[PDB]
Amino acid sequence: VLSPADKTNVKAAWGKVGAHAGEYGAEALERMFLSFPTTKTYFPHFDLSHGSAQVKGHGKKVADALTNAVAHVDDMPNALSALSDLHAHKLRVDPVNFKLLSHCLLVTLAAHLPAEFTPAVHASLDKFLASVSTVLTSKYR
Amino acid sequence: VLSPADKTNVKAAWGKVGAHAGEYGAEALERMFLSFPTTKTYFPHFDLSHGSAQVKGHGKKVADALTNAVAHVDDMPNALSALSDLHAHKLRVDPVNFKLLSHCLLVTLAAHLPAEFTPAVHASLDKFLASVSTVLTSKYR
Amino acid sequence: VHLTPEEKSAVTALWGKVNVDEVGGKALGRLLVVYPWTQRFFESFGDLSTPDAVMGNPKVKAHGKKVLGAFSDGLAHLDNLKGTFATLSELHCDKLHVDPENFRLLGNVLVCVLAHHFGKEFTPPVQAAYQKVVAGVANALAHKYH
Amino acid sequence: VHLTPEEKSAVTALWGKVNVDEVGGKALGRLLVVYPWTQRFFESFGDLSTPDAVMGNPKVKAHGKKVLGAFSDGLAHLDNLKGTFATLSELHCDKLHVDPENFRLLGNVLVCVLAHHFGKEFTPPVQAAYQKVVAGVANALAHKYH
Ligand code: HEM
Ligand code: HEM
Ligand code: HEM
Ligand code: HEM
Ligand SMILES: [C-]#N
Ligand SMILES: [C-]#N
Ligand SMILES: [C-]#N
Ligand SMILES: [C-]#N
């Protein structure tokens, strides 16, 4: 559960991502695939080499989805219903993988936004990603 | 996130507890204390003997809190704020312990409500207890 | 695992009453229903689209038997779970790459199935003994990760 | 934990730039801030009421230095982590009863802090090498649970 201050921290921090969406999303994915090879099992059809166009395009979609979630932080289940169906009913993604990607997203943000990645912001972003993860791994209709 | 069916399932199954609240709660607690000894550290100097009056009294409070959660299943954070303050802010209970108690609550319900504990209801109750756990271990003021 | 003499007696007495042909399937089925993502490891099994479909699936029942058999093997040699599960550990870890947490989940689902079937006979102390058993089995299965 | 010559070289090169008096404190501090329940194990450290209070707490920095020292010693004994961390494992598992998931969390918080301090230098391959290291330390500390 996000506190009112958590939501403000997330909006302020993610707003800094801006045009770096695809870039950061792509980096988080590469970090995940390299650090945790098992996660690759979900993308056997992907060219996962460094600089991969498929990874770049996919990273932008992941990042844009997070931007949408931030814009609907008060009603994420409704805003992410289609993505939940995809990850929970269709793909059946093991929840552990969301913890890994969330961690890689945090590492990416810390590496690009040192001034902004304060302990408080770090905590809020972790809770935010955990909540997004719960929604995407839940089947609620 | 709970589905409409999950809510229906939980309301029906938990509704059967009724006057057995203290009994079932105490049983779940005893199951937890015996199976996972480390959980007793949160209850120093408590009388944790079998049939303990202190445990039955505590079990009733836990059970009643769950009845409270069911009655506010679509807005739990605001209904369980006092319990969040206690478990997250004051006691700082490690989340793993909630998984242990949740499991023991499921075991207690399965042992007492054979007809209610179908695979589908089992799934709904697990999600419900996981959601309650997230609320009680979250700081959202 | 380190079960007391009384605990081992309690565990084997109850296990002697466990239906070898159904309990495994019930635990496996509930795993697939309660934790949907686990279904990804059983696509060849067929229809696992609804709770009824999962529980009635012949392959889930047949496979559940094997699962129960492994738990049975563990109970026969509680002092050598790691050696008993060596081959299975390589399968689930090195081959299938099943996340370890799922091993704990199946163990707990089995405990729920035992409680459901035995009712009041599945007392808190009996549960405590079984928790040591499933914890040991899960740990042995994840040995290739430790 | 096995690291390729390239990984070992890259890991050592990054660690050499680590501020030994501050990095451990920032890692521990963030653990206490991001995962508040961990504060229960440090009730004698005083004021942990706010993020600023935590990060500026002298006991957090002092202790964080010890934590970092343990990771440093791990880096030089990657092939014998269970032996090297035996005493610490008994301390954290049998005495303090710290749930092992928290060992994984602190390791990942350390990785975030390294990323924070070195930015672009903390490349994906460098991160992958460090994940193997923190996973190894976490496993060694949790050995008594295995
Ligand atoms: C912060 C969490 C995550 C977000 C926001 C997210 C978002 C998305 C989005 C927006 C899509 C594309 C939908 C479309 O355009 O049709 C997608 C696809 C997909 N996601 Fe995720 N995702 C997340 C985590 C994960 C994780 C942890 C895995 C598993 C390792 C995963 C595996 C997949 C797969 C396999 C696809 C389909 C890819 C394809 O075939 O094109 N996702 N995700
Ligand atoms: C299903 C989740 C849980 C619920 C619904 C719940 C509910 C409650 C309630 C209603 C109270 C009493 C409020 C009062 O009288 O002031 C309480 C107290 C307490 N709970 Fe929980 N609880 C849960 C899980 C846990 C867990 C996992 C632990 C740790 C093992 C824990 C430890 C405590 C402690 C130490 C107290 C204070 C006891 C005392 O009075 O000394 N609770 N809980
Ligand atoms: C901790 C308890 C578990 C035990 C005791 C166990 C035991 C077994 C055994 C005995 C086999 C058959 C080996 C053979 O006949 O060659 C097997 C196969 C398998 N297990 Fe498990 N298992 C466990 C948990 C899991 C979990 C949690 C998953 C994944 C969510 C899983 C996925 C599989 C798969 C995919 C197979 C291969 C099935 C096939 O034949 O296609 N197992 N397991
Ligand atoms: C996974 C990495 C970790 C490492 C490398 C590590 C290392 C250490 C070391 C070297 C000490 C000092 C030993 C002594 O003086 O006898 C220590 C003490 C301690 N650690 Fe950890 N630790 C880790 C994780 C954790 C976690 C996750 C917790 C709990 C949230 C924790 C709680 C404690 C406590 C309570 C003490 C005693 C502090 C005191 O002196 O009052 N540690 N640790
Ligand atoms: C998709 N991640
Ligand atoms: C409440 N235990
Ligand atoms: C094996 N399931
Ligand atoms: C160690 N903390």
mmCIF file with all atom_site columns, C-alpha atoms in Angstrom, chain D residues 9-89:
data_model
loop_
_atom_site.group_PDB
_atom_site.id
_atom_site.type_symbol
_atom_site.label_atom_id
_atom_site.label_alt_id
_atom_site.label_comp_id
_atom_site.label_asym_id
_atom_site.label_entity_id
_atom_site.label_seq_id
_atom_site.pdbx_PDB_ins_code
_atom_site.Cartn_x
_atom_site.Cartn_y
_atom_site.Cartn_z
_atom_site.occupancy
_atom_site.B_iso_or_equiv
_atom_site.pdbx_formal_charge
_atom_site.auth_seq_id
_atom_site.auth_comp_id
_atom_site.auth_asym_id
_atom_site.auth_atom_id
_atom_site.pdbx_PDB_model_num
ATOM 1  C CA . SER D 1 9  ? 38.939 -8.198  -12.885 1.00 0.00 ? 9  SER D CA 1
ATOM 2  C CA . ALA D 1 10 ? 35.860 -5.998  -13.358 1.00 0.00 ? 10 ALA D CA 1
ATOM 3  C CA . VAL D 1 11 ? 34.527 -6.726  -9.864  1.00 0.00 ? 11 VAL D CA 1
ATOM 4  C CA . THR D 1 12 ? 37.861 -5.957  -8.190  1.00 0.00 ? 12 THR D CA 1
ATOM 5  C CA . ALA D 1 13 ? 38.311 -2.795  -10.258 1.00 0.00 ? 13 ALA D CA 1
ATOM 6  C CA . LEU D 1 14 ? 34.960 -1.418  -9.128  1.00 0.00 ? 14 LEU D CA 1
ATOM 7  C CA . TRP D 1 15 ? 35.409 -2.405  -5.483  1.00 0.00 ? 15 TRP D CA 1
ATOM 8  C CA . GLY D 1 16 ? 38.697 -0.522  -5.364  1.00 0.00 ? 16 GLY D CA 1
ATOM 9  C CA . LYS D 1 17 ? 36.771 2.735   -5.851  1.00 0.00 ? 17 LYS D CA 1
ATOM 10 C CA . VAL D 1 18 ? 34.343 1.982   -3.020  1.00 0.00 ? 18 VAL D CA 1
ATOM 11 C CA . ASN D 1 19 ? 34.530 4.427   -0.086  1.00 0.00 ? 19 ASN D CA 1
ATOM 12 C CA . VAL D 1 20 ? 34.993 1.907   2.745   1.00 0.00 ? 20 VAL D CA 1
ATOM 13 C CA . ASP D 1 21 ? 33.850 4.337   5.442   1.00 0.00 ? 21 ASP D CA 1
ATOM 14 C CA . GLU D 1 22 ? 30.533 5.219   3.790   1.00 0.00 ? 22 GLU D CA 1
ATOM 15 C CA . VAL D 1 23 ? 29.229 2.627   1.303   1.00 0.00 ? 23 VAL D CA 1
ATOM 16 C CA . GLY D 1 24 ? 28.359 0.041   3.951   1.00 0.00 ? 24 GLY D CA 1
ATOM 17 C CA . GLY D 1 25 ? 26.436 2.630   5.956   1.00 0.00 ? 25 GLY D CA 1
ATOM 18 C CA . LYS D 1 26 ? 24.459 3.698   2.883   1.00 0.00 ? 26 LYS D CA 1
ATOM 19 C CA . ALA D 1 27 ? 23.631 0.078   2.129   1.00 0.00 ? 27 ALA D CA 1
ATOM 20 C CA . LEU D 1 28 ? 22.517 -0.685  5.689   1.00 0.00 ? 28 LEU D CA 1
ATOM 21 C CA . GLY D 1 29 ? 20.733 2.642   5.962   1.00 0.00 ? 29 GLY D CA 1
ATOM 22 C CA . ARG D 1 30 ? 18.750 2.069   2.797   1.00 0.00 ? 30 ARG D CA 1
ATOM 23 C CA . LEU D 1 31 ? 17.836 -1.438  3.941   1.00 0.00 ? 31 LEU D CA 1
ATOM 24 C CA . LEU D 1 32 ? 16.372 0.081   7.124   1.00 0.00 ? 32 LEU D CA 1
ATOM 25 C CA . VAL D 1 33 ? 14.524 2.760   5.118   1.00 0.00 ? 33 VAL D CA 1
ATOM 26 C CA . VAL D 1 34 ? 13.243 0.675   2.190   1.00 0.00 ? 34 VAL D CA 1
ATOM 27 C CA . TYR D 1 35 ? 12.366 -2.409  4.269   1.00 0.00 ? 35 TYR D CA 1
ATOM 28 C CA . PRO D 1 36 ? 11.349 -0.871  7.645   1.00 0.00 ? 36 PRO D CA 1
ATOM 29 C CA . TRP D 1 37 ? 10.737 -4.139  9.501   1.00 0.00 ? 37 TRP D CA 1
ATOM 30 C CA . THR D 1 38 ? 14.500 -4.728  9.480   1.00 0.00 ? 38 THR D CA 1
ATOM 31 C CA . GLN D 1 39 ? 14.699 -1.914  12.034  1.00 0.00 ? 39 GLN D CA 1
ATOM 32 C CA . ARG D 1 40 ? 13.433 -4.374  14.664  1.00 0.00 ? 40 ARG D CA 1
ATOM 33 C CA . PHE D 1 41 ? 16.878 -5.999  14.702  1.00 0.00 ? 41 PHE D CA 1
ATOM 34 C CA . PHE D 1 42 ? 18.553 -2.643  15.425  1.00 0.00 ? 42 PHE D CA 1
ATOM 35 C CA . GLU D 1 43 ? 16.429 -1.151  18.211  1.00 0.00 ? 43 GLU D CA 1
ATOM 36 C CA . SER D 1 44 ? 19.607 -0.248  20.130  1.00 0.00 ? 44 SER D CA 1
ATOM 37 C CA . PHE D 1 45 ? 20.856 1.989   17.312  1.00 0.00 ? 45 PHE D CA 1
ATOM 38 C CA . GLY D 1 46 ? 18.706 4.877   18.494  1.00 0.00 ? 46 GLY D CA 1
ATOM 39 C CA . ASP D 1 47 ? 16.850 7.227   16.172  1.00 0.00 ? 47 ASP D CA 1
ATOM 40 C CA . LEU D 1 48 ? 15.643 5.508   12.988  1.00 0.00 ? 48 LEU D CA 1
ATOM 41 C CA . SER D 1 49 ? 12.439 7.586   12.775  1.00 0.00 ? 49 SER D CA 1
ATOM 42 C CA . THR D 1 50 ? 13.070 9.178   9.376   1.00 0.00 ? 50 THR D CA 1
ATOM 43 C CA . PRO D 1 51 ? 15.227 8.526   6.327   1.00 0.00 ? 51 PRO D CA 1
ATOM 44 C CA . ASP D 1 52 ? 17.570 11.399  7.255   1.00 0.00 ? 52 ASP D CA 1
ATOM 45 C CA . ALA D 1 53 ? 17.832 10.153  10.841  1.00 0.00 ? 53 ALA D CA 1
ATOM 46 C CA . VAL D 1 54 ? 18.700 6.661   9.633   1.00 0.00 ? 54 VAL D CA 1
ATOM 47 C CA . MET D 1 55 ? 21.363 7.676   7.102   1.00 0.00 ? 55 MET D CA 1
ATOM 48 C CA . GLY D 1 56 ? 22.999 10.137  9.491   1.00 0.00 ? 56 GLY D CA 1
ATOM 49 C CA . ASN D 1 57 ? 22.901 7.773   12.472  1.00 0.00 ? 57 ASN D CA 1
ATOM 50 C CA . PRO D 1 58 ? 26.496 7.101   13.623  1.00 0.00 ? 58 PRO D CA 1
ATOM 51 C CA . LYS D 1 59 ? 25.696 3.544   14.705  1.00 0.00 ? 59 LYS D CA 1
ATOM 52 C CA . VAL D 1 60 ? 24.298 2.760   11.246  1.00 0.00 ? 60 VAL D CA 1
ATOM 53 C CA . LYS D 1 61 ? 27.497 3.964   9.547   1.00 0.00 ? 61 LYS D CA 1
ATOM 54 C CA . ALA D 1 62 ? 29.761 2.210   12.037  1.00 0.00 ? 62 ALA D CA 1
ATOM 55 C CA . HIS D 1 63 ? 27.898 -1.042  11.648  1.00 0.00 ? 63 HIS D CA 1
ATOM 56 C CA . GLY D 1 64 ? 27.607 -0.638  7.896   1.00 0.00 ? 64 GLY D CA 1
ATOM 57 C CA . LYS D 1 65 ? 31.396 -0.548  7.837   1.00 0.00 ? 65 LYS D CA 1
ATOM 58 C CA . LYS D 1 66 ? 31.503 -4.020  9.409   1.00 0.00 ? 66 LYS D CA 1
ATOM 59 C CA . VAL D 1 67 ? 28.958 -5.302  6.892   1.00 0.00 ? 67 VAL D CA 1
ATOM 60 C CA . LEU D 1 68 ? 31.029 -3.962  4.009   1.00 0.00 ? 68 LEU D CA 1
ATOM 61 C CA . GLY D 1 69 ? 34.109 -5.588  5.510   1.00 0.00 ? 69 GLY D CA 1
ATOM 62 C CA . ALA D 1 70 ? 32.336 -8.947  5.404   1.00 0.00 ? 70 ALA D CA 1
ATOM 63 C CA . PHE D 1 71 ? 31.504 -8.471  1.720   1.00 0.00 ? 71 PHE D CA 1
ATOM 64 C CA . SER D 1 72 ? 35.154 -7.555  1.079   1.00 0.00 ? 72 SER D CA 1
ATOM 65 C CA . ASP D 1 73 ? 36.365 -10.743 2.777   1.00 0.00 ? 73 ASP D CA 1
ATOM 66 C CA . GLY D 1 74 ? 33.827 -12.673 0.735   1.00 0.00 ? 74 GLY D CA 1
ATOM 67 C CA . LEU D 1 75 ? 35.304 -11.305 -2.492  1.00 0.00 ? 75 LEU D CA 1
ATOM 68 C CA . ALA D 1 76 ? 38.669 -12.817 -1.552  1.00 0.00 ? 76 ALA D CA 1
ATOM 69 C CA . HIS D 1 77 ? 37.160 -16.202 -0.616  1.00 0.00 ? 77 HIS D CA 1
ATOM 70 C CA . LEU D 1 78 ? 34.520 -16.815 -3.281  1.00 0.00 ? 78 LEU D CA 1
ATOM 71 C CA . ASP D 1 79 ? 35.333 -20.528 -3.397  1.00 0.00 ? 79 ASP D CA 1
ATOM 72 C CA . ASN D 1 80 ? 34.809 -21.066 0.344   1.00 0.00 ? 80 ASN D CA 1
ATOM 73 C CA . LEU D 1 81 ? 31.947 -18.755 1.329   1.00 0.00 ? 81 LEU D CA 1
ATOM 74 C CA . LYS D 1 82 ? 30.150 -21.319 3.485   1.00 0.00 ? 82 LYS D CA 1
ATOM 75 C CA . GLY D 1 83 ? 33.340 -21.770 5.493   1.00 0.00 ? 83 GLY D CA 1
ATOM 76 C CA . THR D 1 84 ? 34.220 -18.079 5.666   1.00 0.00 ? 84 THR D CA 1
ATOM 77 C CA . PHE D 1 85 ? 30.711 -17.077 6.778   1.00 0.00 ? 85 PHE D CA 1
ATOM 78 C CA . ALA D 1 86 ? 30.134 -20.013 9.152   1.00 0.00 ? 86 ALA D CA 1
ATOM 79 C CA . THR D 1 87 ? 30.345 -17.932 12.332  1.00 0.00 ? 87 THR D CA 1
ATOM 80 C CA . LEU D 1 88 ? 28.212 -15.130 10.887  1.00 0.00 ? 88 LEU D CA 1
ATOM 81 C CA . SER D 1 89 ? 25.650 -17.687 9.710   1.00 0.00 ? 89 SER D CA 1
#
